[PDB]
Design a protein around this nucleic acid. Structure first.
Lengths: 79, 92, 361, 102, 95, 79, 98, 93, 102
DNA sequence: CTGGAGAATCCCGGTGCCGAGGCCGCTCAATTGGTCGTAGACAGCTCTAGCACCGCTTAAACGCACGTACGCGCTGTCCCCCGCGTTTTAACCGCCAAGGGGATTACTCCCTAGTCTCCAGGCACGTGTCAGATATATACATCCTGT
DNA sequence: ACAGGATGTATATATCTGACACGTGCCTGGAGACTAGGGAGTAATCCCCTTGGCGGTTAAAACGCGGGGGACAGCGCGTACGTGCGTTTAAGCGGTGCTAGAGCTGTCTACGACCAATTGAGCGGCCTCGGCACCGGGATTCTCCAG
C-alpha cells in the first residue's frame, strides 16, 4: 500500500535528524503507524474545515488551522 | 445580585436520566463549570470558524462543525445527531 | 364458615418437602451441565461476558423435573424504545458504547435482534452439549413462540434455558409507581431494591397480529427472591421462632395447588396457559392486603390461604392482575391468555374452594 | 419558551444571550443556540448517565465528584474530550500496573 | 570501511545541518490523498497544503524521535524500540 | 523560607501511592519538592497577575482557575 | 512479630489512596508554601480559602499525574523504584524543561 | 483581493536592526504568521481579561496584563517597558 | 501625521486598531491599547530579527532564511519557551547530539 | 599505541540566474474633526470574611533499628542492525494539456438586530428530613510462616 | 502446598445532622411581535491551478552478506528503602476577635463609537541587480589498521 511509501530509509533519515544513533527493526512499522495516526487527526480536522467552507479544495490555511487547534502550530503558510 | 448557573438544568436532566438519584453541591459546581467550559470551547471554535470564512453570523452549521472539530469521533456523531434532531423539531 | 385445617396444610408442607427431597442428583446433573456450558460459552468471543445469576428458581415446585435456568449478561447502557404503548415491551438500543462490546457487533440496525440472539444461542448450545461426555444432553424443541430452549439431561431432566440481559442502568419510567413496599416494609428497602440491576427477556407481542417483534419484557426474579427472604414488617420474620409466618407456607400452598390442578386437568386443553409467577405477583398484592405478621400467623394459615384464593379469584373475575413493578401492565389480558381457559380455571378453583378441598390427600 | 419548542432542557434563550454577549461574532443565527443548547444537553446527559451508573455501582444515591471522575475517566472518548481537565475532589482511577502485583 | 557508528554520527551531523524535507514528496502526497479519501471522497489538495502538512508531519516525527532517544538512553541503551515510542506517546498523553 | 520543606516525606509518599508508584528512592522527595515549587511559581505568577489586573489585594478562586486555564491544566469545581 | 513482605503494605496503600479522594498534602503547610511564593511575588496578598483549595487540588492532581508518568518511566527502565532521573525524563518529555 | 500582511513593516524593523542584511520571502511569510500569531494571542488574552473583570473595553492595562501572562520573564519586563514607552510617546504627542 | 509616527513606532497602529476592532475581542477598544500592542509586536519582531541577523552573520549569509529563524528562536531560551508549541517551516532543528552517543 | 591513507568535508574562486530591492501608479483605509452616550473612574459605605490568635487534642510526621529485595555492575551470548555493494524502482523534473472549482462580482430577500412590552421562569430565601458519616460488632477476604 | 493465626476490609445496625430537595415570592430576563437593513445565499462567470499523463534521467530504495557491538539474561552483592515501633510535632478544630477589603450604589466625565470628509501610505504591477546556488580544484578535518 502507500504507507510503505513512507520508506524505511526516510524513517531512518527522520531518526538521524532526531538524534537516534541506532534503530531497531520494528521502529519502522510503528513509525508508519504513528504517522498514519497523526495524519488521520490533522486531515480529519482539515477536511472538516474544508467541508465547512463548502469547498472541495483543502487550502494550506485549513491545514494550518487544524495544526493550530491541535497545538502543533505551523508558521509560514498563512495567518 | 444573582449568579447565572446551569444548576436547575443539570438537575432536570438528572431527573430525566436517573429519576431518583441525588447530586451534591460540589458535583453541581463541577457540572456548572463543565457546561460553561464546553459552551466556551464550542462557542469559541464557532467564532474562530466563522471568522476564518469571513462570515459574521454563527449558525447551527457553524456549531455543528465546531462540535465535529472539537468532540471526538462517535460521541461527536451522536452529538451532531442530537443537535440536528433538536433543530428539526424547532423548525416545526 | 371455617378455614381448612392448618395441621392438614402442614401435612401438605411435609408432602412439599417430600416433593423437594430429590434435589441432590438433579442438582449435580445440572451443575455439571452449567459448568461445562458456561465454561464453553466463554470460548466464544461474542459472549465473553455471560454468567449465571444466582437465584435455582423453582417456578414449578409440584414437578421439579422441568427446569427454567436463567442466565445473566452484563450489557452496556441501553436506550429503550417502548413498543406500541404496551408499557412492558421495549426495544433494546445500545445507547452509546466506545468499547464496542460484541452484542452491538451482533446487532441488526439499531434494535437488538432477540430472534438472532436466541438463534445463535441455540446454535452454540447445539454445538456444545453434544461435546458433553457421559451426560447425554440432546436438543429438544418447543413451539408456540415462547423463548424456552429445551435441553434434556439424560434422564427426564428437561432444562428450558432463557438467557436474560442484565442492565445496571436506572429503571424505566413505567416501573415508577410500582414496587409499593414503602408503607409495607420501608421506602428505604424500596430504594435499595431500586439500586439493583434490572433484567431483559424477550417475547414478541402476541396480540393478534403482532408477529416476531424484537421486543423485550422486564424480568424481576432476583428482587422477588430477596423479598421472599426478607418479607416481614419485623425483619426477623421466619428467622426466630416467635415470628413464624405463613407467607412462604401460603405461597407454596397456592403454587402447589394451582400446578397440581394444572397437572390433573392437562387432559383438557385449557390449563397449560397460566403460571405461578402470576400467583406470586398476586400473592405480593395479598401481602399488601395482609401486612401484619399477626395477620399471617399459623392460626391464620387457612385464613391467609383463603385470602390468597379469594384474591386470585378476584384477579380472575375483575380481569386485573397488575405487575407489582409495573402498575400499567395487566398480565391477565384476553389475547395473550384465552378467556375460556380463565373461565375453566375459575370453575375449578370455585369448585375446590367450597367443598373443603378434597385434593389435600 | 424556545426550550419547550425545541424539546430541550437547557435554556436556549440563555445560550443565545451568552452567544451575543460574549462577542463571538456580530450576528448570531437562530438555529445556533438551539443546536448549541442541544449539544450541551447531550454531553450533560451522557456524563450524568455514566455518573449515575457509577453511583449505583457503589450503591450511593447521591452523586459526589468521585462518581464524575470515574465516569469521565472510564469512558475513553470522554477522557479524550477532557484530557486537560482536573476534576477537583476526584482522585484517579484504580489503576495499578501489572508488573507491580505479586 | 568505517566503524559501525561513525557514519551514523556523520549522518546525524549531516541531517541536523540540512533543512529540506526528509520524506520523498510524492509517496507522502499519495499517502495524504489516501487518508483524505477515507474521510471525504474526491478531494483536491493545494500543493502548498501537502507541503505544509509534510513540514508539520516531519517536525512531529523529529520531536517524537528526540523524545524516543531520551527514553532509549534512559533505559541505558542506544537503540530505540517500539517500547520507547509507546512510552513517549503515553507520557505526552497522545493515547 | 523552609515552608517548601513543609511538604513532608509521607505526603509525597502518599502522592506516589495514589500515583501507582510502588517504591520510592530517597532522592525523589527533594526533586518532587522542587517540581512542586516550580509548578506553584508558575500558577501563582499567573494568578497574582490576574489579581493585580483587577486592582485587588485578594487572590480568589476564580483567579487561580483562570491561571490554570491558561496553563492548560484546567480545573473544575471552583466556578 | 507479623512483619509483611516489603511490597504488601505498598500495594494496600496504593489501593487505599486510589480509593480515597481527600487531600493528601496537609492543608496548613501547603497554605504556608503558597503564602511564601506569593510573598515573593506581591507583598501582603490575602488569599481566598477556596483559592488555596484550588491550588491544592491542582498540585495534588499534577503530582499524581506526574507520578503516574514517572512510574511508567521506572517500569520502562526494567526497574520498580522511581528515581529523580525518571522525573527529569518525564518532565523533559512533557515539555516543561526540554 | 488585498493580502494585508506585515511585510514592509518587518522589512523596516530589519533595516532598523541590521541595515545591510536582507530577508528571504519564506522568512517574511514566517514573520507574518508570527506577528499574526502573537497578535491573536495577546488580543485573545485581553479579550478574556476584559470579560473576566466585566470591562467592555480593552485598554493598555489589559494589554500589559496579557503581555505579563503570555511572555516569559525578561521578555515581559522589556515588552512592558517598550509598551509603556510608546504609550507615553503617543500621549505626549 | 500617522499615529505610528506620533508614537515613534514602526508597526501600523491604525491596522492594529482595525484588527482589534473587527476581531471581536471586545465591544470597545481603548486607544492606548493598539499603541501598546504595536509596541509589543515591534519589540518581539525586533528581538527575533536581531537574533536571526546574528545567525545570518555567523553563517556568513546576508539574507535571513527560515533556518536562521529556527536557530534564533531555539537558541534563546525565553523565545523557546514562547514558541515551544510552534514548528517553523523550512526550519530544521538545532544541532543537538547526545554526548553519551558520541 | 603511537604514526600514515584516504574518505569526507570546508573554503577558493569563477559563472550565472533568478528572486529581494526598488521605483511607479492607483485607492482603499487611516487620520482629523465634531457629536453623542455611556462605560468606567471615583467615592463612600456596608459587611462578609480572611487573618491573627489561643488551646486542647490526636493523628500523624519524625526518627531509628533492620532485614530483605531491588538496583547496578559485570560477564558472556548471540543475533540483530549497520555498512558497503549491486541491483531494481520510481521520484523528480520538465512539458502540456483540460477542466474543475476558487474567486469575484451582482442582485436579492430573508433573518437577525434592535426596541417595546408583558409575563413566567429562575433565583433567594426558608425548611424537613433524608443519605451519609459516625461508631461498632461481626463476618469474609487476604497474606506470611510453620508442617 | 496447604492449613492456620492473625490482620485488614467490607456488610449490617442505631444514631445523628447538616445538606439536598422542594415550596413561596418576587423581578428581570426571555418571548412575541414589528420593523429596517444587510449579510448571506445564489447565479453566473474568468481563469488559475490542480490533475493527469508522459519521457527521461538518475538519485535513491531495496536486498544481500559479513560481522560486531549491543541487548538481554543471569549471578552477585552491597546498600537503600520499606516495615514497624516508639517518640515528638503541630495539624486541626472550635472559637472569638479585628479590621481589611470585596462588593455595591450613586454620581459624574473623559473616551470611544459613529459619521463624515480628506488624502496618503500601502499594495499591485513593473523591471533589475547582488546573493545564493552550483562546479571543479585546492586545503583541511578526521577516522582507522599496524612494525
Amino acid at each position: 500500500d502507500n504507507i510503505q511509501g513512507i520508506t524505511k530509509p526516510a524513517i531512518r533519515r527522520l531518526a538521524r535528524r532526531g538524534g537516534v544513533k541506532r534503530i531497531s527493526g520494528l521502529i519502522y512499522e510503528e513509525t508508519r503507524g504513528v504517522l498514519k495516526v497523526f495524519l488521520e487527526n490533522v486531515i480529519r480536522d482539515a477536511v472538516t474545515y474544508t467541508e465547512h467552507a463548502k469547498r472541495k479544495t483543502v487550502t494550506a490555511m485549513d491545514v494550518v488551522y487544524a495544526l493550530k487547534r491541535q497545538g502543533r502550530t505551523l508558521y509560514g503558510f498563512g495567518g | 445580585s444573582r449568579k447565572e448557573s446551569y444548576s436547575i438544568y443539570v438537575y432536570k436532566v438528572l431527573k430525566q436520566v436517573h429519576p431518583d438519584t441525588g447530586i451534591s453541591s460540589k458535583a453541581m459546581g463541577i457540572m456548572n463549570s463543565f457546561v460553561n467550559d464546553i459552551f466556551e470551547r464550542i462557542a469559541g471554535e464557532a467564532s474562530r470558524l466563522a471568522h476564518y470564512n469571513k462570515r459574521s453570523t454563527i449558525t447551527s452549521r457553524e456549531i455543528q462543525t465546531a462540535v465535529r472539530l472539537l468532540l471526538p469521533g462517535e460521541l461527536a456523531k451522536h452529538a451532531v445527531s442530537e443537535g440536528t434532531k433538536a433543530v428539526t423539531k424547532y423548525t416545526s | 364458615d371455617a378455614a381448612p385445617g392448618a395441621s392438614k396444610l402442614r401435612a401438605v408442607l411435609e408432602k412439599l418437602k417430600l416433593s423437594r427431597d430429590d434435589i441432590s442428583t438433579a442438582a449435580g446433573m445440572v451443575k455439571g451441565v452449567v459448568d461445562h456450558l458456561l465454561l464453553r460459552l466463554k470460548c466464544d468471543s461474542a459472549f465473553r461476558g455471560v454468567g449465571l445469576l444466582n437465584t435455582y428458581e423453582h417456578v414449578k415446585i409440584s414437578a421439579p423435573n422441568e427446569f427454567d435456568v436463567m442466565f445473566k449478561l452484563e450489557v452496556p447502557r441501553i436506550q429503550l424504545e417502548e413498543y406500541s404503548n404496551t408499557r412492558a415491551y421495549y426495544f433494546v438500543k445500545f445507547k452509546r458504547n466506545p468499547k464496542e462490546n460484541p452484542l452491538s457487533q451482533f446487532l441488526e440496525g439499531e434494535i437488538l435482534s432477540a430472534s438472532k440472539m436466541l438463534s445463535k444461542f441455540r446454535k452454540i448450545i447445539k454445538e456444545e452439549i453434544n461435546d458433553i461426555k457421559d451426560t447425554d444432553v440432546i436438543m429438544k424443541r418447543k413451539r408456540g413462540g415462547s423463548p424456552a430452549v429445551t435441553l434434556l439431561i439424560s434422564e427426564k431432566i428437561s432444562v428450558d434455558i432463557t438467557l436474560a440481559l442484565e442492565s445496571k442502568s436506572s429503571w424505566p419510567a413505567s416501573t415508577q409507581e410500582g414496587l409499593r413496599i414503602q408503607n409495607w416494609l420501608s421506602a428505604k428497602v424500596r430504594k435499595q431494591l431500586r439500586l439493583k440491576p434490572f433484567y431483559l427477556v424477550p417475547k414478541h407481542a402476541k396480540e393478534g397480529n403482532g408477529f416476531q417483534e424484537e421486543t423485550w419484557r422486564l424480568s424481576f426474579s432476583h428482587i422477588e427472591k430477596e423479598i421472599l427472604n426478607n418479607h416481614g414488617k419485623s425483619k426477623t420474620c421466619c428467622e426466630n421462632k416467635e415470628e413464624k409466618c405463613c407467607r412462604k407456607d401460603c405461597l407454596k400452598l397456592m403454587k402447589y395447588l394451582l400446578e397440581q390442578l394444572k397437572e390433573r386437568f392437562k387432559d383438557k386443553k385449557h390449563l397449560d396457559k397460566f403460571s405461578s409467577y402470576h400467583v406470586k405477583t398476586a400473592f405480593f398484592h395479598v401481602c399488601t392486603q395482609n401486612p401484619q405478621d399477626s395477620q399471617w400467623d399459623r392460626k391464620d394459615l387457612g385464613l391467609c390461604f383463603d385470602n390468597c384464593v379469594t384474591y386470585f379469584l378476584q384477579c380472575l373475575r375483575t380481569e386485573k392482575l397488575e405487575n407489582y413493578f409495573i402498575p400499567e401492565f395487566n398480565l391477565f389480558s384476553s389475547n395473550l391468555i384465552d378467556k375460556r381457559s380463565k373461565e375453566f380455571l375459575t370453575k375449578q378453583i370455585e369448585y375446590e374452594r367450597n367443598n373443603e378441598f378434597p385434593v389435600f390427600d | 419558551t424556545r426550550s419547550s419548542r425545541a424539546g430541550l432542557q437547557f435554556p436556549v434563550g440563555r445560550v443565545h444571550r451568552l452567544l451575543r454577549k460574549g462577542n463571538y461574532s456580530e450576528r448570531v443565527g437562530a438555529g445556533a443556540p438551539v443546536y448549541l443548547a442541544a449539544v450541551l444537553e447531550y454531553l450533560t446527559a451522557e456524563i450524568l448517565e455514566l455518573a449515575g451508573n457509577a453511583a449505583r455501582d457503589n450503591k450511593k444515591t447521591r452523586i459526589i465528584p468521585r462518581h464524575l471522575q470515574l465516569a469521565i475517566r472510564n469512558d475513553e472518548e470522554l477522557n479524550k474530550l477532557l484530557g486537560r481537565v482536573t476534576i477537583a475532589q476526584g482522585g484517579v482511577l484504580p489503576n495499578i500496573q501489572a508488573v507491580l502485583l505479586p | 570501511r568505517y566503524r559501525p557508528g561513525t557514519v551514523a554520527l556523520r549522518e546525524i551531523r549531516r541531517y541536523q545541518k540540512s533543512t529540506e524535507l526528509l520524506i520523498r514528496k510524492l509517496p507522502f502526497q499519495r499517502l495524504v490523498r489516501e487518508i483524505a479519501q477515507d474521510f471525504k471522497t474526491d478531494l483536491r489538495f493545494q500543493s502548498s497544503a501537502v507541503m505544509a502538512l509534510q513540514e508539520a508531519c516531519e517536525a512531529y516525527l523529529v520531536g517524537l524521535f528526540e523524545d524516543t532517544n531520551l527514553c532509549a538512553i534512559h533505559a541505558k541503551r542506544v537503540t530505540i524500540m517500539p517500547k520507547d515510542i509507546q512510552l513517549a506517546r503515553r507520557i505526552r498523553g497522545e493515547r
